[PDB]
C-alpha cells in the first residue's frame, strides 16, 4: 500500500485510542484487509459493564475488541493486518498469531513483539 | 451511539478525504454497522488507471468506492450508516437508498439530500 | 463455460430487461460467479420511489442494481462476470472495474467499453 | 413480489431446464431471496462424470443442484423461495423443508407436495 | 492433520450417530474445513415431522443433514472434508462430489464409494 | 434443544479437551448456533510454536481458540452458545460477553462466572 495510506490507518487507530476511558493507557486498533478497514477497537470495559473506569481485570485491550468484532463479522481475520497505537501484550500476541494476522504495525513500543515474530507474523514500527 | 464516537467516525472520513488527489473536492466516506467500520472510500480514479489527476468522468465518488468495497465484502451494506465529509450527489443518493443504508451523516453541504429523505434514508449534518 | 450456458445467461438478462418500465431503453444485468447467478438487475427507479416512469436522474441502470444487490449479499462480486443486454455507460464501467468484475458480456452496443479494457476487464459481444 | 416478476423467475427456471441433457425430463430450479436470485440448477450428471446421458442413479435433480450451490455459497438458503419447473420428488422435498425454504413455486405437476405442506413449506402452482 | 485429531472427528460423528432414532441404522456425519467443524448431522426425520420413527422415504441421511446445514451456513462446503460413521449411499455421494467435498473418511462400510472416487473425491476407511 | 443433544455437545467438548497437551488442565470448547457446531477449541500453544508443553503465558485457552476460529469463520459468534468442559477464566469471560455469546454451559467449576452473569450471558452447569 502507498506510504500515506499506511499513515492514514495509524492515525485512525489513534482517533479511536482517544475514545477510550483508561487513564493509564489509551490504545486503538484497526483491522485492514484487501484495501478495506474491517474492524476497530479500543481499550476499556465491556458494553453494559457498570464502572466505566479501567488496572481492572475486566477491561479488554484494543486488539481484543477488534478481534471480537471480527468474530461477529462475516469477513475472515485471516490474511489481514493490524494497525495498533501500541505494541501488543503477550495475550493479544498469541491470538493475533493464531488468527492468521499477516502483519502488525505499531506506533508506540516487548515480549509480545518477539513472539509474533517467532510465530511468523511480520512487525513494523511507524 | 455516544456523541464522541459519532465524531470519531466523521473525523475518520476526513482522514480519508485527504488521501484523495482531486484538486476540486476531497471527499471521504465510512460505512458503519453494528459498532464496526466496514468500508472506507475517497474520491478518485480507479486502481490501475493511468492519470491520477481527476472533472474527469472516470473518477469515482467516495460513496461509490465504499459501496464497491461493500460489494466485495462478505458483510451486507443493508442497515448500515454512511459517514461522509460531503452531502452526496444524486447518483450516489440513488444507490445509497437502494442499498438499504439506514442513515447518512455529512459534515459539508442539495437534491441528493431531499431524495434520500423521500426514499426513507435519514439524514443529519454534524 | 459451455456455449449454450453462456447464452442462457444472456437470455436471462433479457428476461429481466423486460421487467423494467423505461420507454427509452430496457436493460437487464446478471452477475455470475463459480457457476452460479448471484444477482440480477434492471433499469428503473428505486424501490419506494413515487413515479415509476423513468430521462430522470434518479433511475438506476441495470448494472447499478446488480451491484447494489451484491453489496447486500454475503458473496463477493470480485472475480465474477457480468452479463448485460447492453454495453455499459462510463459510470457503470468505473464501478464494474473497481468491483473486480473479471469480464463483461453484452448483447447490444462505446466509451464504457474501451475504459473497461484499459482497466483490465475483459469484454465480449454475443 | 409483483406478478410479472414472479413469472420472470419461472421463465428463468425454464431457461435452465433446457440446458439439461435428460430425455425423460428437463427440470430447472431457481433460488430467490430478498429480491435476488442466489442459485440455479438443472437435472443431470455431476461435473466431470463420464456419460452425459441420464434413469441413472447418479443424476442430480435440479433442486439438488441448486441446494448444493447454496452450500458452496456464503448466503443462507433459509427464508428463500424455490422456483422450479416441476413439483419436487419426495427426496428433494425433505431437503427443501429442512433447508428452511419458505415456499416452492412450480409450473408442472404428488407426495413431495403434501409433505412440503405438512412440514410448513408453502406451495403454489403457476 | 495429526492422527489423534482425525480420530476425535470420527468419534464426534459417532457421538452424533447415537442421537438418531432409527432402529435400522444410526449414522453421524461431521464437516471439517480449515481446522474447524462447520456442520454435524445424523439420520432421521425432518424437524417438525410427526412420527419420530424412521424405512420411511422422508428420513434424511446424516450427510443430507450436514449438507443442508451447510446451505444455511455462511461458510462454503467446497474444500471441506466429511467424517461419517458410514460409507455414503449413491444419493449422498452425488451431492458430496458436486459440493466440492475434498475427501470422505468413514468408519463402517459400496457403489457410493467408487463413484466418489470416479468423481475425484478421496476416500479413507479408519 | 432436547436434553440428549445438550449432552452430546458437552461430550464433544470433552472429546476435544483430550487432544490438548497440558498436564495441568485439559479443556475443550464448542460453539453452537442454530443447531450447528461452528467451532471447537482446546487449550495449548499456537500452531507452529516450538515447545508443545504448556504455566506458559503463550498457551491459549480453549475458549480463546474457539473465538479465534470464529474470527476466521464467515459465521457470526453473536447469539451462539458455548459448551466448555470448564468454567471460563476472567479473560475468556470478558471476550465471551463482548462476543454476544448468549449462554455458556460448563461441566467443571469462579469470578469468570459472576461476571458473565453481570454482563447478561446466561450460565448453566451440567
Ligand atoms: Cl465470524
Ligand atoms: Cl458482497
Ligand atoms: Cl456484501
Ligand atoms: Cl454455505
Ligand atoms: Cl450457504
Ligand atoms: Cl469472521
Ligand atoms: Zn494486549
Ligand atoms: Zn456522488
Ligand atoms: Zn450505466
Ligand atoms: Zn427430486
Ligand atoms: Zn445416503
Ligand atoms: Zn480462560
Short mmCIF file of C-alpha atoms in Angstrom, two decimals, chain D residues 9-105:
data_model
loop_
_atom_site.label_atom_id
_atom_site.label_comp_id
_atom_site.label_asym_id
_atom_site.label_seq_id
_atom_site.Cartn_x
_atom_site.Cartn_y
_atom_site.Cartn_z
CA UNK D 9 -38.44 -16.23 -12.18
CA UNK D 10 -40.39 -19.18 -13.52
CA UNK D 11 -39.29 -18.43 -17.05
CA UNK D 12 -35.68 -18.40 -15.87
CA UNK D 13 -36.06 -21.78 -14.27
CA UNK D 14 -37.46 -22.76 -17.70
CA UNK D 15 -34.44 -21.28 -19.49
CA UNK D 16 -32.28 -23.54 -17.37
CA UNK D 17 -34.37 -26.68 -17.69
CA UNK D 18 -33.46 -26.64 -21.37
CA UNK D 19 -29.73 -26.76 -20.63
CA UNK D 20 -30.18 -30.21 -19.17
CA UNK D 21 -29.48 -33.38 -21.15
CA UNK D 22 -32.09 -35.82 -19.89
CA UNK D 23 -34.50 -37.17 -22.46
CA UNK D 24 -37.05 -38.23 -19.86
CA UNK D 25 -37.49 -34.91 -18.07
CA UNK D 26 -35.86 -31.50 -18.25
CA UNK D 27 -36.13 -29.58 -14.94
CA UNK D 28 -34.90 -26.17 -13.87
CA UNK D 29 -34.76 -24.58 -10.44
CA UNK D 30 -34.04 -21.04 -9.16
CA UNK D 31 -33.45 -19.88 -5.58
CA UNK D 32 -34.72 -16.39 -4.76
CA UNK D 33 -34.26 -14.40 -1.57
CA UNK D 34 -34.61 -10.70 -0.74
CA UNK D 35 -35.23 -9.77 -4.38
CA UNK D 36 -32.22 -11.63 -5.67
CA UNK D 37 -31.50 -14.90 -7.48
CA UNK D 38 -28.92 -16.81 -5.46
CA UNK D 39 -28.66 -20.16 -7.24
CA UNK D 40 -29.85 -22.04 -10.28
CA UNK D 41 -29.86 -25.69 -11.17
CA UNK D 42 -30.98 -28.26 -13.63
CA UNK D 43 -31.14 -32.02 -13.80
CA UNK D 44 -28.18 -34.12 -14.85
CA UNK D 45 -24.90 -35.83 -14.06
CA UNK D 46 -22.24 -34.40 -11.75
CA UNK D 47 -19.45 -32.17 -13.20
CA UNK D 48 -16.73 -34.47 -14.52
CA UNK D 49 -18.93 -37.54 -14.80
CA UNK D 50 -18.19 -39.58 -17.91
CA UNK D 51 -21.55 -40.21 -19.53
CA UNK D 52 -23.64 -37.10 -20.11
CA UNK D 53 -26.86 -39.04 -20.73
CA UNK D 54 -29.09 -39.60 -17.70
CA UNK D 55 -32.83 -43.32 -15.35
CA UNK D 56 -29.23 -43.30 -13.98
CA UNK D 57 -28.99 -43.18 -10.14
CA UNK D 58 -26.15 -40.66 -10.36
CA UNK D 59 -28.00 -37.76 -11.95
CA UNK D 60 -28.92 -34.91 -9.61
CA UNK D 61 -32.32 -33.26 -9.67
CA UNK D 62 -32.44 -29.54 -10.40
CA UNK D 63 -33.31 -28.89 -6.76
CA UNK D 64 -30.32 -30.94 -5.59
CA UNK D 65 -28.06 -28.80 -7.81
CA UNK D 66 -29.45 -25.51 -6.54
CA UNK D 67 -29.13 -26.76 -2.95
CA UNK D 68 -25.53 -27.86 -3.46
CA UNK D 69 -24.73 -24.43 -4.93
CA UNK D 70 -26.26 -22.85 -1.82
CA UNK D 71 -23.98 -25.00 0.32
CA UNK D 72 -20.96 -23.53 -1.54
CA UNK D 73 -22.43 -20.02 -1.36
CA UNK D 74 -21.89 -17.63 1.54
CA UNK D 75 -25.56 -16.80 1.54
CA UNK D 76 -28.08 -18.81 3.56
CA UNK D 77 -30.86 -20.79 1.88
CA UNK D 78 -33.10 -20.23 4.92
CA UNK D 79 -36.08 -17.97 4.15
CA UNK D 80 -35.59 -18.17 0.41
CA UNK D 81 -38.08 -19.36 -2.19
CA UNK D 82 -37.69 -22.05 -4.79
CA UNK D 83 -38.99 -21.62 -8.35
CA UNK D 84 -38.97 -24.95 -10.08
CA UNK D 85 -40.38 -26.08 -13.45
CA UNK D 86 -41.63 -29.20 -11.70
CA UNK D 87 -43.22 -30.25 -8.44
CA UNK D 88 -40.38 -31.83 -6.42
CA UNK D 89 -39.88 -35.52 -5.63
CA UNK D 90 -40.03 -36.75 -2.03
CA UNK D 91 -36.19 -36.72 -1.70
CA UNK D 92 -35.94 -33.10 -2.76
CA UNK D 93 -38.93 -32.22 -0.59
CA UNK D 94 -37.28 -33.48 2.65
CA UNK D 95 -34.27 -31.32 1.96
CA UNK D 96 -36.14 -28.24 0.86
CA UNK D 97 -38.13 -28.32 4.12
CA UNK D 98 -35.12 -28.92 6.31
CA UNK D 99 -33.32 -26.10 4.45
CA UNK D 100 -35.86 -23.55 5.64
CA UNK D 101 -37.16 -22.89 2.15
CA UNK D 102 -40.17 -20.67 2.78
CA UNK D 103 -42.20 -21.53 -0.30
CA UNK D 104 -41.98 -23.53 -3.54
CA UNK D 105 -43.49 -22.30 -6.85
#
